């Protein structure tokens, strides 16, 4: 794939949500160019390269209790980039809870993600 | 004020959406910094200079006849920043119209917004 267009951003960013929901850390790392940063929540330090974005995602992830699906349409540039809004479903102190999420992406020539920025912090976590 | 917390970044952000769907102009401009950045749609060259800024908003708010409003919460961040979902309406070629939008902000230590990036393109408008 080239620089995505604005409708290819609106697929690739729905198909991160949709390995993000099925746990597939595999292929979400696989979505991310080799050398890319990931800064989840947005604030925090960077993390640069498959192998830390893999562990990452492992930690997050791996643990099982995680839903993911989009809460609005992914917002498209010209550029390769796009935000999305969507809604994680994990578990919090024994209960289900909720996290809104937006996750912004700049994607590279190749149609991999270069950088993602993650917004929420505990505002955005809520409980029964 | 100081640099926003989560919460205070929740609240300016929203009052961001309020003043765009009120349509004033000179409100929303003062919610800037002197140095701040417009980046909108997100992959145009940002636009700089507080009159600049004044001149943007009139050329898509002037008609009176925009609404906005927040279609999801504010995603905040602990340095300053945030993400909101919300949807444009509005009147183009002769049709009633929806846009979705996603803005990215920034804000300085004093409260004021010092970078504003709007993700939005052509394939996030609809007819009403
Ligand atoms: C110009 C416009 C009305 C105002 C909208 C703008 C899209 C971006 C958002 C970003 C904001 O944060 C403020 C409103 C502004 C529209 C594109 C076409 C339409 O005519």
């Given at each position: 794939?080239?620089?995505?267009?604005?409708?290819?951003?609106?697929?690739?960013?729905?198909?991160?949500?949709?390995?993000?929901?099925?746990?597939?850390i595999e292929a979400i790392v696989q979505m991310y160019a080799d050398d890319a940063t990931v800064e989840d929540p947005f604030g925090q330090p960077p993390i640069h390269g498959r192998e830390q974005i893999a562990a990452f995602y492992r930690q997050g992830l791996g643990g099982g209790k995680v839903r993911a699906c989009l809460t609005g349409p992914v917002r498209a540039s010209h550029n390769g980039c796009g935000a999305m809004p969507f809604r994680v479903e994990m578990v919090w102190n024994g209960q289900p809870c909720a996290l809104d999420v937006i996750d912004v992406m700049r994607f590279d020539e190749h149609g991999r993600i270069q950088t993602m920025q993650a917004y929420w912090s505990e505002v955005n976590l809520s409980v029964r």
């Amino acid at each position: 794939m080239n620089l995505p267009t604005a409708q290819e951003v609106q697929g690739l960013m729905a198909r991160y949500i949709e390995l993000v929901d099925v746990g597939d850390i595999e292929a979400i790392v696989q979505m991310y160019a080799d050398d890319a940063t990931v800064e989840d929540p947005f604030g925090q330090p960077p993390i640069h390269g498959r192998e830390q974005i893999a562990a990452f995602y492992r930690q997050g992830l791996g643990g099982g209790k995680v839903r993911a699906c989009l809460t609005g349409p992914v917002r498209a540039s010209h550029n390769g980039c796009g935000a999305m809004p969507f809604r994680v479903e994990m578990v919090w102190n024994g209960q289900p809870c909720a996290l809104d999420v937006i996750d912004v992406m700049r994607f590279d020539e190749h149609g991999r993600i270069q950088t993602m920025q993650a917004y929420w912090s505990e505002v955005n976590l809520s409980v029964r």
